[PDB]
């Protein structure tokens, strides 16, 4: 299954497929083929098995040696050991977030259900690069600090440039946790020092305490239909949710409720929403059958919902509770909030436009990323430490946790501040 969710976030032009296939062995993929124009801009999924020969390096199935195929310029070979079967240490899960700035709201959502991260830095561009800081800050807000910085694209980048970049990032982030996070330079054109990464992810990132006894909550981020185009009438199936569970052991045959709900017909107001109920058909993770779905892992829960809800990606950031979950489904919400004194996620060589942003004005639409949900809503009352927001589609608030608040600076939204629900 899975034990931890390590995320693979990283700004434009570092190469995703080479690094993702080295760590998991499962390709990051989704629509267009044209696998991506540059680096993956979709929310990729992948799981993997991490075993040892009693060595800090992680074998392949063929554990005698491993000859890469990253480049035919030279032969990159590494040796994990010699063969006689290897001991399974754990089953790991990844969360490949978008690597592009416009997709920030999606990157936030996907990130918010991980248990650790890997900041994929690229040495090609600017030294205190916008997105590195954006990522790091969001991570410390959500409730994580289990980060391993990875210098992913320094294959042709000289050692002065690459040294200056790690220095400037680590010096800018002087108020964000990063001093207890290692910085592992690797090759992505010769897959070198990959074996030492395997030692790091088992060290810096154990399994955090998971609450089995507590009531099941599944947060769905990806939508999958298994009926698909060309289905037969008596080959009928349910609709499958790619979600991570962050609380409770969800068992097979259990009934689960999707709690933001669907709005009642001919509503004259903003209420009323009614949750949808679906019975769990199957609990699939990796490529191995399971009867349980332990928390701390990203699992494909097939449920008895019908094709229309899974025919496109429409279940992004929905909260699912088993069953008749107590969590309130607000339509208008009381945010406590604070703002950054800089504009996060933007800053170029001329140092534009990380200038301090003006105060929020009422009746402006802002993206409130609450939980893994992403709703848009307008601010109806605006006091400094008390704003009232009215949301277009209702938000199930599992706990008052955190929020991330963004404002439409130009073409798309950009992160301005965070806070906590009251």
């Amino acid at each position: 299954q899975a034990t931890i969710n390590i995320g693979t976030i990283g700004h434009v032009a570092h190469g995703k497929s080479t690094v993702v296939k080295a760590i998991s062995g499962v390709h990051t993929v989704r629509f267009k083929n044209e696998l991506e124009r540059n680096i993956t801009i979709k929310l990729g999924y992948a799981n993997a098995k991490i075993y040892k020969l009693d060595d800090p390096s992680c074998p392949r199935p063929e554990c005698y040696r491993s000859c890469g195929s990253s480049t035919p310029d030279e032969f990159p070979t590494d040796i994990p050991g010699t063969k006689g079967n290897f001991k399974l240490v754990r089953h790991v899960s990844f969360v490949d977030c978008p690597g592009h700035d416009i997709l920030m709201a999606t990157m936030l959502n996907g990130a918010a259900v991980m248990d650790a991260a890997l900041l994929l830095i690229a040495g090609n561009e600017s030294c205190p690069q916008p997105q590195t800081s954006e990522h790091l800050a969001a991570i410390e807000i959500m409730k994580l600090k289990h980060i391993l910085i990875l210098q992913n694209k320094i294959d042709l980048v000289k050692e002065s440039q690459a040294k200056e970049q790690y220095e400037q990032i680590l010096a800018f982030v002087q108020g964000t946790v990063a001093e207890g996070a290692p910085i592992i330079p690797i090759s992505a054109q010769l897959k070198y020092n990959i074996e030492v990464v395997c030692e790091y992810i088992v060290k810096k990132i154990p399994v955090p305490p998971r609450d089995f006894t507590s009531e099941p909550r599944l947060i769905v981020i990806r939508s999958f239909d298994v009926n698909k185009p060309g289905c037969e009438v008596d080959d009928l199936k349910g609709g499958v949710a790619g979600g991570s569970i962050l609380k409770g052991v969800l068992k097979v045959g259990q009934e689960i409720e999707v709690r933001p709900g669907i709005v009642s017909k001919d509503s004259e107001g903003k209420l009323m929403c009614k949750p949808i109920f679906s019975k769990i058909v199957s609990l699939f993770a990796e490529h191995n059958d399971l009867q349980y779905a332990a928390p701390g892992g990203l699992i494909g829960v097939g449920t008895k919902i019908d094709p229309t809800l899974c025919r496109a990606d429409r279940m992004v950031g929905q909260v699912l509770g088993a069953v008749g979950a107590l969590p309130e489904i607000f339509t208008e919400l009381e945010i406590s909030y604070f703002l950054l004194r800089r504009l996060l996620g933007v800053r170029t060589e001329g140092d534009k436009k990380a200038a301090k942003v003006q105060k929020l004005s009422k009746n402006e639409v802002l993206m409130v990323n609450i939980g893994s949900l992403s709703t848009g809503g307008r601010v109806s009352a605006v006091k400094a430490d008390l704003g009232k927001i009215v949301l277009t589609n209702p938000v199930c608030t599992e706990v008052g946790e955190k929020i991330a608040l963004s404002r439409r600076v130009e073409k798309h939204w950009r992160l301005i501040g965070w806070g906590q629900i009251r």
Binding site: I154, E159, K163, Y166, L170, E179, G180, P182, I183, I184, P185, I186, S187, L190, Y192, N193, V196
Partner: peptide, 17 residues
């Protein structure tokens, strides 16, 4: 912090031309 980096830098960059 930077020990992790420099150890692996002298591992990596010795194998470059």
């Amino acid at each position: 912090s930077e020990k992790e980096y420099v150890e692996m830098l002298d591992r990596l960059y010795s194998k470059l031309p």
